[PDB]
From a paper:
The extracellular domain (residues 58–796) was expressed as a secreted protein from insect cells, purified and crystallized in space group P212121 with two molecules in the asymmetric unit. The overall structure of DPP10 is very similar to those of DPP6 and DPP4, with Cα-root-mean-square-deviations (r.m.s.d.) of 1.1 Å (for 646 superimposed atoms) and 1.5 Å (for 578 atoms), respectively. Each subunit consists of two domains: an open (no “Velcro” architecture present) β-propeller (residues 82–517, shown in yellow in Fig. 1) consisting of eight blades each built up by four antiparallel β-strands and a classical α/β-hydrolase fold (residues 517–679 and 707–796; shown in red). DPP10 contains the glutamate residues (Glu-233 and Glu-234), but the serine is replaced by a glycine and the tryptophan residue preceding the serine is replaced by a lysine (changing the sequence to GKGYGG). In DPP10, the entrance is narrowed by the presence of Lys-77, Lys-126 and Glu-763 (channel colored in red). According to a PISA analysis the two DPP10 molecules in the asymmetric unit of the crystal form a symmetric dimer with a total buried surface area of 7300 Å2.
In this paper, we present the crystal structure of human DPP10, a naturally inactive member of the prolyl oligopeptidase family that belongs to the S9B serine protease subfamily. The Ca2+ binding proteins (KChIPS) and the dipeptidylpeptidase-like proteins (DPPLs) DPP6 (also known as DPPX) and DPP10 (also known as DPPY) associate with the α-subunits of the Kv4 subfamily to form a ternary complex of approximately 750 kDa containing 12 protein molecules (4 copies of each protein per channel).
Author numbering:
A (entry chain B): 65 to 783
B (entry chain A): 66 to 782
The structure:
């Protein structure tokens, strides 16, 4: 009874899921690192294991990032890692020679003790590239000097191979704007032109004598957007670079490139998207020429579905598999696998649907061409989980679940990765149990062995109370939505508990999920006897498009009304205390958390909001415009979704606004603007701001934040 | 209902009504603002004219008014935007006193403009205005303007207006130009910030993409503004002559801490070395540029009040100035000096006209037609200020004027004499709710009263509003006041909470007869908290000896005193050691912080606004004055900081309030503090106001007071 979960535990190194950082190399050798922190080669044939790196990635300035060369003769360490946006990190690199020790500084020519925007490795051999001053550099091997592939790079204006903010956070959802041809002969990359894009300033108060902060291109709602070209260079000899032109329909009009991928060692598929995000064009490009052939096109009456989807091919290209929406009847559309048959030049490709039901095919993992099978992740088995399924491409059109019996009750939510010949696959658990990675043979899920058990962490949460989350199911409109109630160790049916209602932090995400998670609220629960509640309302993703697009043009309108009807039901329970009800949400969820805190009725005694996005006119183009469309251009519906005007009350409501000053996603401006109206409106509120922090606070401050929130919620909830 | 509540202080009943009195002739005084009306008064006939009416509303809430010399026009400032402290930037309009019609005041080619400065001249209707750091001149309402300087460059080269360092630290006002008595000539400062490092004031609250400014702000030991003093003639050619520095200062770092006209040609410019230990009074013939060394000063610590303005013979045979005199043990005090000017470089016999342990604060006037000179002095009492006259040529006698005005109701004064000195304005400011009055010189018949602050008087009358017991403490060889402001109903029995308020800038005086009403008065009345002020060493206006006890030990001394004062406070029966709180802002936030460390924890909670937390991060001319140069000559700078060795603030409940746009104490100070405070794991609470200054706007304001009030009241329970 004195073995329960305290905040500083979450920072204990016992917890903190240990990720195997598994990676394929041959169809034999998997490079998964990090059991004890050791990088390891494993031959799945012989079981033979080699120690590549040891507890060394300490010794060189706390190297936080590791990558093993293709030829397995070297390791690339990143140390001095500095955050930038989300996936963007800028650090210094070093090269450990796997066979003998000796480490090199990785520097651009003429430059010493340097800092790089990106490093990684290539595909063939020991080749690697690194980005510096927004220019791409290439080293054919450890031997040779580097080769600057682009001179066009200009700091904070023209980017090469790395994403500017808009492309990283919104469009691409990763900072890697370049891609390697399968044979390492060729490199495709994005040239992003921010010349005309308006810039926002991230201030720095904490530096030297006179601190100076940066200014980056950040197009706001309806603003000038980054123009962008897609080039391709050949890494052998001449380095002739060819721009791959857009589809003729998009030529001259505003557009984004939301994906590109290699199919052959020459052809690539670049998905183009209009600024409005209602029109998709899949193009296939011959890189030796620049021949660009319209292949498939899509449209929406609201906004286009997952834009990063990557199609699988015949490796010749006779056929290819992709996921698209199918009307499915009433109950809306669901993403299902498509059979498109590419031919004969000859536009037109026959489409055959390989899947259907009310559930989604999330990702298409692999196509095993030697047989009749294709592999994917699906909610079929259950909307709350994810499972690994195979269907037979050519054939009966049948379907079968693989992951279903792995843990039974202990793994309901998966992800997986197949070897390059698809002969076997890695199965990440992430399920209700403390996550476990495992390596199976394809044709025979004998489960073989287990790569990572997260052992220490398992026994850690075992000791602690750690209850089971009752799940109620609500009917809103025509839908059925999950309400997850996480309840204190000892639960009297009798008493009146305090209720924390946590918001989904970005739209189209899924709160209630079998995915294992441990975090602050778990502490709020156990100590402090608070029940935390999550409810996935309309707009929450991963069930149908119909729930997902219920948000279009009404933002904060719908999600809020649902969150409230969910509190309503919550309210009619005996064991929750209407007197003490609190809300929490961050980012966008801070936005909705705020909308909920206005005049409808006051169901909340106190609530706390972190990096709240408070006015959509002030948020990023590709985000606002997606849901609300263009601003003063076509719509004043933008005035409607704001926290800023009409603050008309937050009454006895106790409000806590937490914001990072250096935040690059939700600018501090959002809370500044809010706080301003909040004063002129005469509303009781309390704020905590972290000088020079981001949307995600550093390790230093973070604990302080949790402590803050924890104290806040626990204290206000007291009777 | 009959005690003082916060929102009263914002009630327009309160808010001292300032007459904004101003002389014109030796007859007509222009004091405005009784009902908000601008008024001419003929002190001969009593005749009053209404110049302006309840119109300075109608034109966009005009916040600022000035009447032309010839009394035919009024200059309104509206759209007033704060800049630093005295610096305001607004749009101007010209009301024609005789016939209403109003003009836009614009630089040529510019429409609906915004100006850095306007005011008026001396002779006639002439006026000048500053735009893009250039000086413009209008000989009259008729004529087009005349650009007197093209050298102006935004936030780099300033003309006639002070950059931050000169406004806040050196000059203590933003007016860098001065008019010759006859309006023939204009002297002004050219401030060159080219090489001075710049600090950024961020703006989060603006339009789509807010952009904040960046101004030259030399920090401790940094590059400083270079500056020249030119003079232009406002008639014809506009030949402009630079007035060269003293030869000794030539080529070395220096400030100009004052300039004033003496004749319609000669000026006295006081020069100061960067170190602030050497003064040179120079007198300059403007038609030539002849610059003659007159008097020089030195200190072993730092030079005394630098804005002192000397009075002359109007010929220049003699002149009066205030300087320190050794006075014996007990230190030095500023007393009036008789310097006799006669031919060439230096000499000039010095005769001291005053002495004792007390100071001559300001020398107001010299009546040349008789044997008298006029000044303000602490003679009558260190806590007050009185208006004294001494006989220059003669017995060397002294007599107090203000002594019997209010007896017990006015002990603290200031005054202004008419141009011929024939009669004077006496501002009360004393213990009673301030009252301005107009007296005849040779006969203080008190004549009449200009401003009674009537409504305000009856306002505080109704409310409880107690009397401040004053204890006197012995520290070292000195005797220092401790003012205890006590709740309406005071039991000798109970244990009260104690708020200890800090003096906000060094060399100021907390305990003073000067009337004041503010938040703490509310803290007192409602919430039964006793607020305490104690003027320790370094506090000004008694001797230099108390004042300079700070040199090179900053936060060292003031703190030890503030504590020994808490000690004594602690031994009282009726104060509760359990509940003790501290408050201080700006610099006082600095000391408030030093007190909150390790010595012992005598405080349960304390609150700090725009704390200056590291002197290396404060302004050059401030830090360097007390602590001298930085890594240049001293690491004693490491000593005075809050930043390292936050070693504890224990159960201490701390509230840090800071404006984001603050241009005096940068937000950096609290950012820096807050940083260490987290890595040190200390419990603290913060409230920051986006886009506010060192002085919060009206909007936020109230919210701040509420905060502080709640904080202090709640923690003390
Ligand atoms: C405010 O102060 C600044 C700094 O003192 C001042 O800028 C400088 O002004 C002087 C004016 O003469 C310049 O001095 C030189 O004049 C002759 C031209 O005949 C040249 O020989 C010089 O060549 C170089 O001198 C410097 C040597 O390092 C260089 O830094 C400089 O950029 C020249 O290349 C030079 O022209 C001087 O150039 C500037 N720059 C600086 C930083 O001193 C400015 O004029 C002042 N504003 C006013 C009106 O007071
Ligand atoms: C990214 O976009 C910027 C937008 O500013 C591009 O800058 C553009 O550069 C071109 C040529 O450098 C400019 O054209 C001009 O034409 C005249 C006539 O010959 C010539 O005198 C100028 O020197 C210049 O060449 C153009 O005005 C300018 N602006 C625009 C709107 O494009 C930049 O080229 C782009 N970068 C890349 C590599 O895509
Ligand atoms: C470096 O890795 C080795 C194993 O490769 C670790 O050595 C173990 O240390 C633990 C202490 O936690 C001992 O209980 C074991 O006996 C050691 N060996 C084995 C086989 O586990 C070592 O912990 C690693 N260094 C760290 C912690 O960074
Ligand atoms: C995709 O959405 C955009 C919204 O930006 C549509 O934009 C058109 O813009 C004009 C501008 O005046 C409007 O008059 C039209 O009504 C809009 N068309 C609509 C509503 O669709 C764009 O046409 C859309 N296209 C598709 C394929 O849906
Ligand atoms: C005024 O004080 C400053 C220092 O506060 C003196 O500056 C001198 O600076 C040099 C720099 O290396 C030192 O070596 C000297 O010790 C300083 N002189 C001293 C002791 O004062 C400056 O000389 C002082 N001048 C006067 C007139 O007192
Ligand atoms: C290698 O190790 C694993 C560990 O359980 C085992 O399952 C596997 O059978 C071994 N190798 C073989 C026989 O394939
Ligand atoms: C704000 O809070 C303070 C104290 O909690 C309270 O005195 C005041 O009534 C509140 N203001 C309003 C109008 O709610
Ligand atoms: C205008 O003055 C009159 C009397 O002179 C007064 O009653 C009135 O209050 C004044 N102005 C305003 C702001 O009402
Ligand atoms: C004007 O009135 C004042 C106020 O009572 C009085 O002192 C003065 O003698 C009067 N002067 C004349 C000349 O009317």
């Amino acid at each position: 009874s004195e073995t329960r979960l305290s905040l500083e535990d979450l920072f204990r190194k016992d917890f903190v899921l240990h990720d195997p950082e598994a990676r394929w190399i041959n169809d034999t050798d998997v490079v998964y690192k990090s059991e004890n922190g050791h990088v390891i080669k494993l031959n799945i044939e012989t079981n033979a294991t080699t120690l590549l790196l040891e507890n060394t990635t300490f010794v060189t300035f706390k190297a936080s990032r590791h990558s093993v060369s293709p030829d397995l003769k070297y390791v690339l360490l990143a140390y001095d890692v500095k955050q930038i946006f989300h996936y963007s990190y800028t650090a210094s690199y070093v090269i450990y020679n796997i066979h003998t020790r000796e480490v090199w500084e990785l520097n651009p020519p003429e430059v010493e003790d340097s800092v790089l925007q990106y490093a990684a490795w290539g595909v063939q051999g020991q080749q690697l590239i690194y980005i510096f001053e927004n220019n791409i550099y290439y080293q054919p091997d450890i031997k040779s000097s580097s080769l600057r592939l682009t001179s066009s790079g200009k700091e904070e204006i023209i980017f090469n191979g790395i994403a500017d903010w808009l492309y990283e956070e919104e469009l691409l959802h990763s900072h890697i704007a370049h891609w390697w041809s399968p044979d390492g002969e060729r490199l495709a990359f994005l040239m992003i032109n921010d010349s005309l894009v308006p810039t926002m300033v991230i201030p720095r108060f904490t530096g030297a004598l006179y601190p100076k902060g940066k200014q980056y291109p950040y197009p706001k709602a309806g603003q000038m957007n980054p123009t962008i070209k897609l080039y391709v260079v050949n890494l052998y000899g001449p380095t002739h670079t060819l721009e791959l032109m857009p589809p003729d329909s998009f030529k001259s009009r505003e557009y984004y490139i939301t994906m590109v991928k290699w199919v052959s060692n020459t052809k690539t598929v670049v998905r183009w998207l209009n600024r409005a995000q209602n029109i998709s064009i899949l193009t296939v490009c011959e890189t030796t020429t620049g021949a660009c052939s319209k292949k498939y096109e899509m449209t929406s009456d609201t906004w286009l579905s997952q834009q990063n989807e990557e199609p699988v091919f015949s490796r010749d290209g006779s056929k290819f598999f992709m996921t698209v929406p199918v009307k499915q009847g009433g109950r809306g559309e669901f993403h299902h696998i498509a059979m498109f048959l590419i031919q004969s030049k000859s536009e037109q490709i026959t489409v055959r649907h390989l899947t259907s039901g009310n559930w989604e095919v999330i990702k298409i993992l692999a196509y095993d061409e030697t047989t009749q099978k294709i592999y994917f992740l699906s909610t079929e088995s259950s909307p709350r989980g994810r499972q690994l399924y195979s269907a037979s491409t050519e054939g009966l059109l049948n379907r079968q679940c693989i992951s279903c019996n792995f843990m039974k009750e202990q793994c309901t939510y998966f992800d997986a990765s197949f070897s390059p010949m698809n002969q076997h696959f890695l199965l990440f658990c992430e399920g209700p149990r403390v996550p476990v990675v495992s390596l199976h043979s394809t044709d025979n899920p004998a489960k073989y062995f287990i790569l990572e058990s997260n052992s220490m962490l398992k026994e850690a949460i075992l000791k602690k109370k750690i209850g089971k989350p009752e799940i109620k199911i609500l009917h809103i409109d025509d839908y059925e939505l999950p309400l997850q109630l996480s309840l204190p160790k000892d639960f009297m049916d009798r008493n009146q508990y305090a209720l924390l209602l946590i918001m989904d932090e970005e739209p189209g995400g899924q709160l209630v999920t079998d995915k294992f998670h441990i975090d602050w609220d778990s502490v709020l629960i156990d100590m402090d006897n608070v029940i935390v509640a999550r409810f996935d309302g309309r707009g929450s993703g991963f069930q149908g498009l119909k729930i997902l697009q219920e948000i279009h043009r009404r933002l904060g309108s719908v999600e809020v009304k649902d969150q409230i009807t969910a509190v309503k039901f919550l309210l009619k329970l005996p064991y929750i205390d209407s007197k003490r009800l609190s809300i929490f949400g961050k980012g966008y969820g801070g936005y909705i958390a705020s909308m909920i805190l206005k005049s409808d009725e006051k169901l909340f005694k106190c609530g706390s909001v972190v990096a709240p996005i408070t006015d959509l006119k002030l948020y990023a183009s590709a985000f606002s415009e997606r849901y609300l469309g263009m601003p003063s251009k076509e719509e004043s519906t933008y005035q409607a979704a704001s926290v800023l005007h009409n603050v008309h009350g937050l009454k006895e409501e106790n409000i806590l606004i937490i914001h990072g000053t250096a935040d690059t996603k939700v600018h501090f401006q959002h809370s500044a603007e809010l706080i301003k109206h909040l004063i002129k409106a005469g509303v009781n509120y309390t704020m905590q701001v972290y000088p020079d922090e981001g949307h995600n606070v550093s390790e230093k401050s973070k604990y302080h934040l949790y402590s803050t929130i924890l104290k806040f919620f626990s204290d206000c909830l007291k009777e």
